[PDB]
Write a protein that binds this ligand. Structure first.
Ligand SMILES: Cc1cc2nc3c(=O)[nH]c(=O)nc-3n(C[C@H](O)[C@H](O)[C@H](O)COP(=O)(O)O)c2cc1C
Length: 169
C-alpha cells in the first residue's frame, strides 16, 4: 500500500482506532497496518506516506513498543515524507499530559526532515496541557475512548477525509 500505518497499543484501543482508520481509507489496498512491536525501524522506509499511532501511558510517557524503537528513529529515511499522527488518551484523568505520546513522536519525527500533515482542532476537548499541541492545535487526531467514545467514529471519518486531500487520494 502507499500508506503505512504503524501503531503501538497496550490495552488495544489504539489498534482498534488504526483498524478503523484503515477501513475509512478503503482497506488493505490503501493502508497497510503494522504493529510497531513487530517492526524494525527500517520497515518505515517502505512508505512515502506514514501514519503514526500511539497512546500515552505512565505520566505523559510513550507506549512501551514506541519507547523501545524511539532511539532507532533517526536511522530512518523521513526526508520529505508526509507523516500524520493519531493517539488515544484520557483528558479527564490526565489533563496535564493529554496525548503527550503523540506529541513526543511528532516532535522527534518532524525534526528528521519530514512534513507533518493532519493537524486537528483542540476545541472539541477539555484539557490543561499537551505536548501534542503547537500553535493552538493538535499535531494529529486525538481520540479519547475513556471520555468521548461517542465522537470517535465521526472524528475518524472527518480526519481521513482531511488526510486524503493531503496524501494524494
Ligand atoms: C495508568 C494509566 C496511565 C495513563 N497515562 C496517560 C497520560 O499520561 N495521558 C493520556 O492522555 N492518557 C493516559 N492514559 C489513558 C490511555 O492513553 C487510554 O486509556 C488509551 O485508551 C490507552 O490506549 P491503548 O489501549 O492503545 O493502550 C493512561 C491510562 C492509564 C490507565
Amino acid at each position: 500500500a502507499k500508506i503505512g500505518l504503524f501503531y503501538g497499543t497496550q490495552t488495544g484501543v489504539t489498534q482498534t482506532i488504526a483498524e478503523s482508520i484503515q477501513q475509512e481509507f478503503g482497506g488493505e489496498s490503501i493502508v497497510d497496518l503494522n504493529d510497531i512491536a513487530n517492526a524494525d525501524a527500517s520497515d518505515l522506509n517502505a512508505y512515502d506516506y506514514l501514519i503514526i499511532g500511539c497512546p500515552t501511558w505512565g505520566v505523559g510517557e510513550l507506549q512501551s513498543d514506541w519507547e523501545g524503537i524511539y532511539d532507532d528513529l533517526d536511522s530512518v529515511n523521513f526526508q520529505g515524507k508526509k507523516v500524520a499522527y493519531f493517539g488515544a488518551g484520557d483528558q479527564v484523568g490526565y489533563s496535564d499530559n493529554f496525548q503527550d505520546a503523540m506529541g513526543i513522536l511528532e516532535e522527534k519525527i518532524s525534526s528528521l526532515g519530514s512534513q507533518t500533515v493532519g493537524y486537528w482542532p483542540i476545541e472539541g476537548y477539555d484539557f490543561n496541557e499537551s505536548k501534542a499541541v503547537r500553535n493552538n492545535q493538535f499535531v494529529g487526531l486525538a481520540i479519547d475512548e475513556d471520555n468521548q467514545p461517542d465522537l470517535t467514529k465521526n472524528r475518524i471519518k472527518t480526519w481521513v477525509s482531511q488526510l486524503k486531500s493531503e496524501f494524494g487520494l
